[PDB]
Structure formats: structure tokens, C-alpha cells
Amino acid sequence: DADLRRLSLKNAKQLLRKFGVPEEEIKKLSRWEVIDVVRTMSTESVAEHQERYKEECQRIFDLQNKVLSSTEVL
DNA sequence: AGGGCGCCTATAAAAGGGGGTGGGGGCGCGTTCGTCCTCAGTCGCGATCGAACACTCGAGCCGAGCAGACGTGCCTACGG
Numbered sequence: 001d002a003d004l005r006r007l008s009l010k011n012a013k014q015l016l017r018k019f020g021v022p023e024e025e026i027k028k029l030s031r032w033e034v035i036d037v038v039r040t041m042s043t044e045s046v047a048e049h050q051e052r053y054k055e056e057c058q059r060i061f062d063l064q065n066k067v068l069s070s071t072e073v074l
Numbered sequence: 075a076g077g078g079c080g081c082c083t084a085t086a087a088a089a090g091g092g093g094g095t096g097g098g099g100g101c102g103c104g105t106t107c108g109t110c111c112t113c114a115g116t117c118g119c120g121a122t123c124g125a126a127c128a129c130t131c132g133a134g135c136c137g138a139g140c141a142g143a144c145g146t147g148c149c150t151a152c153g154g
Contacts, residue, residue: 005116032115 004035004042012038 007015009031016026016034019041025034 001116 001039004039007035007038009034016041 004012009029012031012034013026013029015038019038021037021041025037
């Protein structure tokens with residue numbers, strides 16, 4: 001977070017251009033918002049923890065539905 | 075209308091002031107730069123609150139022991 005705020009708006013603008021951030025966020029260029037967006041993009045937690053639980057539950061549930069209903073002869 | 079005369083051209087020199095023109099210097103103004111102030115954001119430190127663990131007390135459950143009661147076997151006493 002330190003060096004991202006050391007980026008001195010202009011180089012952070014060029015970095016947001018490099019990552020592929022849309023031109024609206026580059027255009028507004030409030031520097032705190034820019035550095036929060038570039039920290040988020042360089043990251044790209046409790047809503048992900050429960051979503052990964054739901055994803056793991058859904059995968060095996062769908063897999064169990066497919067195997068035990070299949071009429072494939074093994 | 076035309077000859078003679080006045081004036082222009084050229085040459086030297088001075089004297090002094092006045093006027094004209096070009097260049098430089100001085101003055102004043104505006105612009106630019108630097109510094110300071112203010113706001114926002116971030117990090118560090120201290121205090122307070124919540125959670126987790128440990129200790130203590132009590133209650134319940136299980137096991138063991140003893141006592142009571144009846145069967146059965148043996149011995150004695152009583153009755154025929």
C-alpha cells in the first residue's frame with residue numbers, strides 16, 4: 001500500500017492503462033480512488049470464503065447427480 | 075523677347091547655437107517563482123473489551139458389602 005501511494009498519480013494512471021482498467025476510472029483520477037483501484041487490480045474475503053464453500057458443494061452435488069443416474073455399462 | 079544679372083554648382087576655414095535623428099540608459103511595472111499553509115490520508119501507539127481456558131463444587135451413578143429370608147441337608151430329641 002505504501003509504494004502504491006508513492007506511485008505519484010501519473011505513473012498510477014499509466015499502470016491502470018497497462019492493466020486494462022476502463023478509461024472512466026483513469027479519467028476521473030481522484031488519486032486515492034486510483035490507488036485503491038490499482039491495489040484491487042493487483043489483488044485480482046469472507047464473501048469469497050462462503051462462495052468457495054458453495055462452489056465446492058455445487059460441484060460434487062452435480063457430479064453425484066450425474067454418476068448415480070447414469071445408465072452407462074462399466 | 076532677349077541680354078544682363080542673380081543664383082546654382084565646386085573649394086578652405088571658423089565661430090556657436092539650434093534642430094534633427096538615432097541610440098542608450100533609466101525607471102516603473104508586471105510577471106514569475108518560491109515558500110508557506112492547509113487538508114487529507116496513513117501509520118503507530120495506547121486503552122479497553124471480549125473470548126477462552128482453568129479451577130472448583132456438586133450431583134449422579136456404579137460397585138461392593140452386609141443383612142434378611144427361605145431351601146435343604148444333617149443331627150438330635152420326642153413320640154409312638
